[model samples]
Target: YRYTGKLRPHYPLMPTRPVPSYIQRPDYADHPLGMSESEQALKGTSQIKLLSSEDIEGMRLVCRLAREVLDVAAGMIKPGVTTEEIDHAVHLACIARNCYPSPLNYYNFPKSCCTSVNEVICHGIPDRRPLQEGDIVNVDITLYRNGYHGDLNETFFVGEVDDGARKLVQTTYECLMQAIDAVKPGVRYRELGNIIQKHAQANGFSVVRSYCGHGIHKLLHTAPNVPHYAKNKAVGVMKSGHVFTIEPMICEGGWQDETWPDGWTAVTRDGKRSAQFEHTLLVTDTGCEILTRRLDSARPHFMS
Candidate 1:
């Protein structure tokens, strides 16, 4: 099978690592087929939950841990560091905190986190290939603890990338922020897509429509669907006590994507470049809070 737009499968991924017995896990953890029966059952009954105060507390804690894990993985990004190495750092960081890596084996995903480089979009499985200079990568990290899950990610410059790649990364992040800024009580979820689309297209980037963000709580993913393109039909409305994410996968070319043979690793069909940013948000009574907001001590020296 043909592969790689200079990025393809480096098969024989490393085996899954162990989580200590003291660490609590999601229902899908260690399943023979990674089947999450709870998630499957809940899928049939659609109810977007309004998290209680205690649930909100749990989310804050878990989301903070997820942010730390993502930071550690990203700090290691530079020319010649393999994605497999980044995954190892993510896995260990989760374990050290007595948290379970949310993506590990969930629906049979091979890695603890997703590392999407260049043309690769979301769900890119971490592999043995070393990141090269001039490349861009997104490290999607999620952590589970105390019955809550916090999920977030950011794209980083492997070294110094081209102007097109740099602008795409910057624009994608702004798209997520602009869409989140529009979130308030009684606002339609579908409206975010238009917000994101406007920014991305204005910057000459395209919005990917196939994958949309969703609510996260007990399950790694849930309602409501948060779209990132213009005029989408995502259901539901924002209200207080709703905890969710608005992560957009933006591309530099056409808005189409395809999957690799491993059944994860979604890449752009045109093999240009893609970038993404994610934030686990809490809709408050008045406005919203970016629960996974970057800390002042955050690595890679953000906020230039």
Candidate 2:
């Protein structure tokens, strides 16, 4: 039988951390601010924005900073460490870099980063729960700098995980990289899903259906909703200078998901384990560039 480990999220999750007065904040800092009317209208057109050379450079800067922030938080993951502690440390890191934690107060989300553990597929709220041995966690980090947004995430073992758990995390990373490898100028957004869904299913994992990646540049969430499933209708062709993300959330059970009462925390419906990986990619003439790419030292070797 599979390890049917129980995962009950500790309730009364911490409220949004207050940003220091010195830090420059995003428009959604205090309240629930969403895309503007222009942005909303643009979504209907299905026109993916091709970034300019200067804007592409701006994305590179913010994405690099985002990688550093995620790496710092990931280093703190281990048994006995609380998710809230990671959130706080990442908040400070963003401030030090002069960037705003993009998740804070965006539609009233109350945290500096997302910490999804075990069955929690995505958007798991950071809380006081101390991680335990044999647990798996995904730390999602996003930051805003110079009017651009950078997002990325990775699943990590809390301590020593089982072989089944190891395979799930390793396969999730493979789904992301293989899908990214399929990206390049003139590639259709729908094609990436086929690549991601295929690799995930081949490993006996189910691809998440509730959430998909989005174009991230000047806006927190923008055009080109990239789904990580087969036969999806997502439209838009990759063009040189287009920046977006391809994050696949894979589960060990059925792909269906259920949300907690909190409205943000998404979990696998069957209470099975889940894993995910994300990266901000810039579409180039030859191929895509992983803007939030990790350094060799920062990459996690789950097999090790």
Candidate 3:
């Protein structure tokens, strides 16, 4: 019940731009860009360093709980349902499992979970809007449990979607995985952008620059902001203990986007559809582990 439509148009490549009001700006937005130009550069970005040893176990537990909640909510995604209904489902699931939906009231976001419908880029608030056929949507699920939080999201196809919609959702998921595969102990964090950008371009798509993946450890949004485009100046050594997300918003048409009057709904400028997926990860001594994994019962088109 997440979304509908086809991916069309092509966005231009350009320097990073301002995020529409729909997405929450990181806490460090006030700092000048390139202020540190070094390891300190990781400070303002969405990089959330690994949790302390005492906290890792708790983080894993919270992440597992978040995943289960998402599965339960996803099962309720039918065409007749309202986003508010989905929000009700999410809230009940979280409360039933003794966790809290993190986005609710966090920075005044109205809903229990984010329901970014078709053209919405991210941070689309849940409302009375009923899902329609051929729409695509991203249900961004975050859970707070035992003083820790876990974050993850997936773009879903509503009823029968067009080939272009399929391409955007499938390709966007692929870009996120490729970016994650590029993560390792010695690799530069910026390498993720290269891998993701290559795939998007190969499919004739544009990677959204306005929003980037973020660090999600104890704090919902942390340091070491991760970008999913090529030639990014992001700095950091992917040593063990680094934890963050590498979700890239892929636009099927133009890369340009504008916010709706609500100040929280980011949509494609031309009303075309946008797609995205996210997974929070912990960089281990070897590779990495997906903290916010998909639920077994939830059926989604793009399987990684």
TM-score of each: 0.96, 0.94, 0.82
Worst 10 residues of 3 by lDDT: 8-17
Tens-digit lDDT string for candidate 3 (90-125): 877877777767776565555578888877888887
lDDT of 2 by residue, 58-126 (tens): 999999999999989988988999999999999999999999898988777788899999999999888
Per-residue lDDT tens digits for candidate 1, residues 1-304, read 4554678777678887788879998989979788887788778444689999999999999999998998898789899999999999999999999899999989888789999999998999888898999999999999999899999999998788888887888888889888888888999888999999998889988999899999999988888878889998878889999989999999888989888888888888888888999999999978899999877664332233
Q: Is candidate 2 or candidate 3 better by TM-score?
A: 2
List candidate 2 segments past 4 Å from native: 1-5, 32-43, 296-298, 301-304
Name the better of 2 and 3 by lDDT.
2
Off by over 4 Å in 3: 1-48, 295-304
- Worst lDDT run of 10 residues, candidate 1, spans 295-304
Top candidate on TM-score is: 1
Deviation in Å, model 3, residue 207 alpha carbon = 0.9
Q: Taking the candidates one at a time, how many backbone clashes does each contain?
A: 0, 0, 21
| Residue 85 CA displacement from its true place in model 3, Å | 0.6
- Could you say which candidate leads in lDDT? 1
